């Protein structure tokens, strides 16, 4: 899901 | 409202763009009728474009400085259908970015790009208008500067493109599999917000402004009005000739405000207001006008054939492979001396005006 894959801090 | 998706996720429903299909976005079905209209429009985009390409390119006659800033402009509709497209059906089909984060970034830098560049080459057309129309004099100009000040364009366009490669903001679009700039939250880390407006305004709304100003200059000079013969109105034939092109580039502008502008102003809307819904924030909206502004790249080439006889004739001139150019060729310069080609018409050395060599030509 969007959420638990905040994992977005890369970009 | 909204989750990260548009949709809200009062279901546990909504899934990343980048993990899952985001059909409970849309339809199934119009999933695949926007990877529908993707596939119609590479084949169209793909070959109108190149086609200008490799007409100008290959008919030596159509050497003329504007005719350097339309292959940019083609140039830059090609990477939309060869790049953009391409990537953008194969989600659409798949029903969300299989390619996942480092490709949403890939995508929405090209495209992005692509769009920049455009106005920004709109732009400075309107420029070359507007220098054309008050000095005739042909020595302040050169080719060169021409292909130095395409690549300028190139280069600011990467100024906003490239930065949110560069820690800024990023993202994909409503129903999306189209990344674009971040307008629905304000990741702080990312500074979002300051790059919204920055970007809409300097890159898209400021050259809008200006190509509108530079044309209102054309105003007062070389009008719509053009009697199709040099005599009447017209001080000259070349000056006659030159109206025309004049008209084609305003028509060329106005297809391209209309395709982006819904754009650009859904754009801001969301930026002031995320989280809601505009007349109705959704999945549909945003999707609509990105996607036709994907239309923009196959309509130049149309309004060339429509707009211009010489291309016509050279393109003709082109489509079958020998001459084959009956229909009353351009009828002037399809080439200065006659016909213009990279060989039959287009002889060697095209003749020169004035004792001295007017045009830089014949060199």
Redesign the interface.
């Known amino acids: 899901?969007?959420?638990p894959?905040q994992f977005?801090?890369?970009? | 409202d909204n989750?990260?998706?548009v949709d809200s996720?009062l279901s546990?429903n909504?899934?990343?763009?980048?993990?899952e299909p985001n059909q409970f976005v849309q339809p199934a079905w119009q999933i695949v009728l926007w990877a529908a209209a993707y596939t119609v429009i590479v084949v169209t985009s793909v070959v109108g474009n190149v086609v200008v390409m490799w007409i100008i390119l290959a008919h030596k006659r159509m050497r003329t400085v504007t005719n350097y800033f339309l292959v940019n402009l083609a140039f830059a509709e090609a990477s939309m259908a060869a790049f953009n497209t391409v990537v953008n059906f194969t989600y659409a089909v798949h029903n969300e970015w299989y390619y996942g984060?480092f490709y949403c970034?890939f995508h929405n830098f090209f495209p992005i790009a692509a769009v920049f560049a455009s106005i920004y080459s709109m732009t400075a057309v309107a420029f070359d208008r507007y220098m054309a129309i008050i000095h005739p004099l042909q020595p302040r100009l050169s080719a060169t500067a021409t292909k130095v000040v395409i690549c300028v364009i190139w280069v600011l366009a990467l100024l906003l493109a490239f930065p949110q490669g560069y820690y800024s903001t990023?993202e994909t679009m409503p129903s999306r599999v189209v990344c674009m700039i971040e307008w629905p939250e304000h990741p702080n880390?990312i500074y979002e917000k300051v790059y919204h407006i920055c970007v809409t305004v300097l890159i898209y709304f400021l050259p809008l402004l200006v190509i509108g100003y530079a044309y209102t200059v054309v105003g007062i000079t070389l009008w719509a009005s053009e009697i199709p013969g040099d005599s009447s109105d017209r001080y000259h034939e070349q000056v006659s000739a030159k109206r025309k092109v004049v008209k084609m580039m305003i028509v060329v502008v106005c297809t391209f405000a209309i395709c982006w502008l819904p754009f650009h102003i859904f754009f801001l809307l969301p930026y002031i207001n995320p989280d809601l819904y505009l007349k109705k924030f959704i999945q549909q909206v945003y999707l609509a006008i990105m996607w036709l502004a994907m239309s923009s790249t196959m309509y130049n080439p149309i309004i060339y054939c429509c707009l211009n006889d010489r291309f016509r004739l050279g393109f003709k001139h082109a489509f079958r492979c020998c001459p084959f150019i009956s229909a009353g060729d351009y009828e002037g310069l399809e080439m200065k001396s006659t016909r213009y080609l990279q060989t039959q018409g287009s002889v060697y050395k095209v003749s020169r005006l004035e004792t001295t060599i007017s045009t830089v030509v014949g060199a």
Not at chain 2, 14 to 19: R, V
């Open positions: 899901r969007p959420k894959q977005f801090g890369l970009m | 989750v990260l998706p996720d546990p909504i899934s990343t763009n980048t993990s984060l970034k990023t880390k």
